[PDB]
């Protein structure tokens, strides 16, 4: 309607560093005029899949608020983002609700985030006591005891560090390169809309 401000999509897609999967950052988009053409302007998108709305009709809708979640994950796990899936990345790091509506985008990024012998500054959880409810973030890294015997101090026999590190090299085959993932979430038409495309009111 009255407002006219371009949304900061280029502040997310053209970002330099993406955080680790266990501590993904959520960015709120509001009070701007959306434009979903420059989003599709990039051709080599590995996956661009929308669940609730259809992508071709995203230019005439008003959203109550937009949320963007960005991270990097292995290729073999890129299919563990759709709702209702299970595994070791959708059970302990990032879970989506069953009635989720929005669009997910993912593309290969081996040209940037890889190192000559591996990158050890990307982490992911491997050990936890229970599955997490949707859209829940965990940061604590307490020593996780596995056996009946209580643990303390340092790790070791049956005492494991609940985190692990990746290793990205330009030598692995397809399925191990670091794939960058951005997920959009939004609700439709129940409140004064802050994000809207060009209108014909």
């Amino acid at each position: 309607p009255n407002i006219t401000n371009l949304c900061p999509f280029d502040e997310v897609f053209n970002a330099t560093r993406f955080a680790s999967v266990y501590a993904w950052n959520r960015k709120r988009i509001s009070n701007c005029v959306a434009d979903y053409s420059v989003l599709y302007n990039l051709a080599p998108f590995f996956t661009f899949k929308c669940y609730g709305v259809s992508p071709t009709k995203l230019n005439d809708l008003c959203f109550t608020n937009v949320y963007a979640d960005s991270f990097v994950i292995r290729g073999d796990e890129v299919r563990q983002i759709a709702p209702g899936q299970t595994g070791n990345i959708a059970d302990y790091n990032y879970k989506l609700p069953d009635d989720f509506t929005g669009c997910v985008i993912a593309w290969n990024s081996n040209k940037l985030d890889s190192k000559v012998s591996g990158n050890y500054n990307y982490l992911y959880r491997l050990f936890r006591k229970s599955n997490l409810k949707p859209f829940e973030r965990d940061i604590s890294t307490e020593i996780y005891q596995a056996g009946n015997k209580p643990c303390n101090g340092v790790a070791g026999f049956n005492c494991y560090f609940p985190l692990r590190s990746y290793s990205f090299r330009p030598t692995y085959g397809v399925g191990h390169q670091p794939y960058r993932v951005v997920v959009l979430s939004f609700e439709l038409l129940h409140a004064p809309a802050t994000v809207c495309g060009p209108k014909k009111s």
Partner: antibody, heavy 119, light 109 residues
Framework: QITLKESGPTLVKPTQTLTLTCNFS??????????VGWIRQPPGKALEWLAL???????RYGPFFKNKVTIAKDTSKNQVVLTMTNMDPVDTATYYC???????????WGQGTLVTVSS | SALTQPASVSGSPGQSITISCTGT?????????VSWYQHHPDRAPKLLIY???NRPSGVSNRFSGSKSANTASLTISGLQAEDEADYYC???????????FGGGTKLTV
């Protein structure tokens, strides 16, 4: 303009430790992705890879000279420093400093300098 | 090293010639990011091939590349005296991040 330059000695004693420096003009090492590597070539044979340095303090040395070489950076002065020990007469070679990227292994090779080991 | 290259190949000017670089299935095999440089006598090396059949700006489209089961090959068409220099092949290896290719000096008649 993007230029690479090298600075160091020419006559090094076997007991001494070789030191060499490279200056780069046209970008900064702090940028996400760019690295700087060192290449030596002994006369009569091919070139060789010594070491490389990344933006966030990641170090990768040659598999056979882990305990002898050591490199460091100074982005406030746009310099990179290489130090090697236990000179031997076979180490006579021409040295180069070059840019490093993940897709393209080496892009901008410097002019380099020839160094010899003798009395 | 476990990586070699033929010593020298000479070809007549104005005719297509190809110089090949060889490796092993384990270290390089079917990897990617192969590269090819040329080194002139007393001049800094410059990049000519950085990806398979790919060249950066300042194109010299006559040069071409090819990758076979365990080798690579660069083809030059229309040779000149300027082409007379050393040619280095290059690739990633699993055991170490090195190239160490001997390089074959080009000759013209």
């Amino acid at each position: 303009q993007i230029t690479l330059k090298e600075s160091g000695p020419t006559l090094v004693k076997p007991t001494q430790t070789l030191t060499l420096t490279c200056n780069f003009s046209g970008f900064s090492l702090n940028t996400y992705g760019v690295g700087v590597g060192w290449i030596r070539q002994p006369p009569g044979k091919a070139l060789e890879w010594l070491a490389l340095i990344y933006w966030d303090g990641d170090e990768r040395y040659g598999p056979f000279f882990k305990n002898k070489v050591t490199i460091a950076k100074d982005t406030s002065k746009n310099q990179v420093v290489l130090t090697m020990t236990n000179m031997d007469p076979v180490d006579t070679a021409t040295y180069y400093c070059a840019r490093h990227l993940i897709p393209t292994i080496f892009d901008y090779w410097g002019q380099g300098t020839l160094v010899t080991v003798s009395s | 090293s476990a990586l070699t290259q033929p010593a020298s190949v000479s070809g007549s000017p104005g005719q297509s010639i190809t110089i090949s670089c060889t490796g092993t299935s384990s270290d390089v095999g079917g990897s990617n990011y192969v590269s090819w440089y040329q080194h002139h006598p007393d001049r800094a090396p410059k990049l000519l091939i950085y990806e398979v059949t790919n060249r950066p700006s300042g194109v010299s489209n006559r040069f071409s590349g090819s990758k076979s089961a365990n080798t690579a090959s660069l083809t030059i068409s229309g040779l000149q005296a300027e082409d007379e220099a050393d040619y280095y092949c290059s690739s990633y290896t699993t055991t170490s991040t090195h190239i160490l290719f001997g390089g074959g000096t080009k000759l013209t008649v």
